[PDB]
Amino acid sequence: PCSFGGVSVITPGTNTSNQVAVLYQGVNCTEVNVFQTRAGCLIGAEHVNNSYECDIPIGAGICASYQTSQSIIAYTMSLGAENSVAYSNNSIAIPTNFTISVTTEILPVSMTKTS
Amino acid sequence: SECVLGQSKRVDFCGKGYHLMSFPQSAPHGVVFLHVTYVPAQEKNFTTAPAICHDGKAHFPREGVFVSNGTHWFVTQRNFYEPQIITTDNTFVSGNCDVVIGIVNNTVYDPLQPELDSFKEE
Amino acid sequence: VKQIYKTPPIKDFGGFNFSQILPDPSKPSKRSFIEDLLFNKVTKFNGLTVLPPLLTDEMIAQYTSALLAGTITSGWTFGAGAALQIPFAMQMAYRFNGIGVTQNVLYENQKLIANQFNSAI
Ligand SMILES: *[C@@H]1O[C@H](CO)[C@@H](O)[C@H](O)[C@H]1NC(C)=O
Ligand SMILES: *[C@@H]1O[C@H](CO)[C@@H](O)[C@H](O)[C@H]1NC(C)=O
Ligand SMILES: *[C@@H]1O[C@H](CO)[C@@H](O)[C@H](O)[C@H]1NC(C)=O
Ligand SMILES: *[C@@H]1O[C@H](CO)[C@@H](O)[C@H](O)[C@H]1NC(C)=O
Ligand SMILES: *[C@@H]1O[C@H](CO)[C@@H](O)[C@H](O)[C@H]1NC(C)=O
Numbered sequence: 001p002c003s004f005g006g007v008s009v010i011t012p013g014t015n016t017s018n019q020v021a022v023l024y025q026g027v028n029c030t031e032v033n034v035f036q037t038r039a040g041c042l043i044g045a046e047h048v049n050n051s052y053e054c055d056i057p058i059g060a061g062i063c064a065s066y067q068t069s070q071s072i073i074a075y076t077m078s079l080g081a082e083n084s085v086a087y088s089n090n091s092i093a094i095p096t097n098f099t100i101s102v103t104t105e106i107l108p109v110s111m112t113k114t115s
Numbered sequence: 116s117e118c119v120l121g122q123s124k125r126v127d128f129c130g131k132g133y134h135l136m137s138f139p140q141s142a143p144h145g146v147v148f149l150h151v152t153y154v155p156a157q158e159k160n161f162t163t164a165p166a167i168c169h170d171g172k173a174h175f176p177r178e179g180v181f182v183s184n185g186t187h188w189f190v191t192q193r194n195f196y197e198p199q200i201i202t203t204d205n206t207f208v209s210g211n212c213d214v215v216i217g218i219v220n221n222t223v224y225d226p227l228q229p230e231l232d233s234f235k236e237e
Numbered sequence: 238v239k240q241i242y243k244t245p246p247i248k249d250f251g252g253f254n255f256s257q258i259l260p261d262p263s264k265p266s267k268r269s270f271i272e273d274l275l276f277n278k279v280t281k282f283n284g285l286t287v288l289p290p291l292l293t294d295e296m297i298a299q300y301t302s303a304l305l306a307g308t309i310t311s312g313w314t315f316g317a318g319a320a321l322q323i324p325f326a327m328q329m330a331y332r333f334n335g336i337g338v339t340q341n342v343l344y345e346n347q348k349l350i351a352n353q354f355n356s357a358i
Binding site: 001004005006025026039057059060061079080081082083084085086087088089090091092093094095 | 239240241242243244245247249251282286287288289290291292293295296299300303306310311314318319320321322323324326327
Binding site for chain 3: 126127131132133152153154155156158160163165166173175180193209210214215216217
């Protein structure tokens with residue numbers, strides 16, 4: 001059976017711009033700025049080799065964002081800043097001052113008793 | 116239960132950090148907790164040591180570890196920096212100090228001996 | 238985890254061995270021996286679209302290696318706040334003090350404990 005796929009659109013919010021990004025699922029670009037993933041064919045973006053945090057997930061470690069003209073870019077998502085701690089057999093990390101933070105957490109409890 | 120009615124030990128369960136206490140608030144179809152943690156900052160680096168031998172006898176600290184004030188071996192607890200002088204009531208003694216690997220050298224101050232020293236002066 | 242931690246190239250931990258759970262840098266997909274045993278002992282045109290996960294197995298391995306290294310080098314402190322370094326032996330002492338055993342029991346039986354741990358691994 002000749003190839004098919006799901007049609008999916010990548011975009012920022014309408015309160016930013018109206019530029020788009022077109023993603024074809026599970027089939028590569030030879031049958032439709034062209035970029036290829038394991039997810040399929042992504043049209044309407046630009047491959048960048050800088051690592052940011054993810055904005056919208058796409059698949060296979062690929063996320064897209066709309067930054068500064070201004071256009072759709074995509075990249076391989078990071079896992080935050082690379083960091084390591086100096087280790088020895090005679091070192092330790094001991095604090096001296098502190099803060100008191102408050103984090104909002106929200107859990108849903110009930111729903112409307114429909115009948 | 117665990118975070119409003121009392122103080123859970125369970126880390127990573129009500130907010131991020133050592134859990135202190137919380138406050139609940141009303142919400143439509145829901146609840147909103149406000150957790151209060153103890154997040155530390157502003158650290159230095161500190162040369163450490165597992166124990167101290169004084170007169171052949173080892174010393175393990177009752178709480179805390181032995182810390183750095185520069186190149187000296189003083190002592191405080193494990194989650195806030197407030198160094199102390201090594202006394203007997205901060206440690207205890209179990210065994211010879213030769214099986215203990217990584218041990219360092221320091222004197223151990225005693226509280227009783229200078230109060231004893233006030234007797235032998237007179 | 239808030240940040241990625243990479244293990245140091247120092248493998249002195251008081252005798253404890255973790256080269257069977259830390260990744261080898263030599264692999265193309267950085268994974269450990271036990272991870273490789275795990276990933277090998279787990280075995281259309283009707284609308285079936287198999288969406289792949291957002292996080293590939295390499296990324297999962299990155300996250301786990303970070304958690305593992307933080308555990309090894311920082312105790313539980315990186316769970317609460319910023320990571321605070323510490324030797325493993327003293328961390329082990331900490332954890333034995335948590336269960337009602339004094340830390341001298343460790344520091345006198347350290348090699349025995351390390352050998353038992355390595356054997357169990
Ligand atoms: C969203 O749109 C409204 C009306 O177009 C505008 O007033 C508002 O500033 C926009 N939000 C942002 C963050 O620009
Ligand atoms: C589409 O199939 C595979 C998968 O990406 C790719 O290697 C191949 O080159 C593509 N087909 C053509 C004709 O380029
Ligand atoms: C992307 O990779 C190419 C080589 O494949 C490199 O020349 C280029 O500088 C990279 N892009 C960025 C923004 O670093
Ligand atoms: C001193 O502390 C800093 C803060 O993390 C650390 O980067 C550095 O390695 C420490 N110095 C030594 C000699 O370990
Ligand atoms: C730490 O390791 C070094 C290896 O260079 C060794 O010389 C030293 O005795 C060790 N110190 C402790 C306290 O384990």
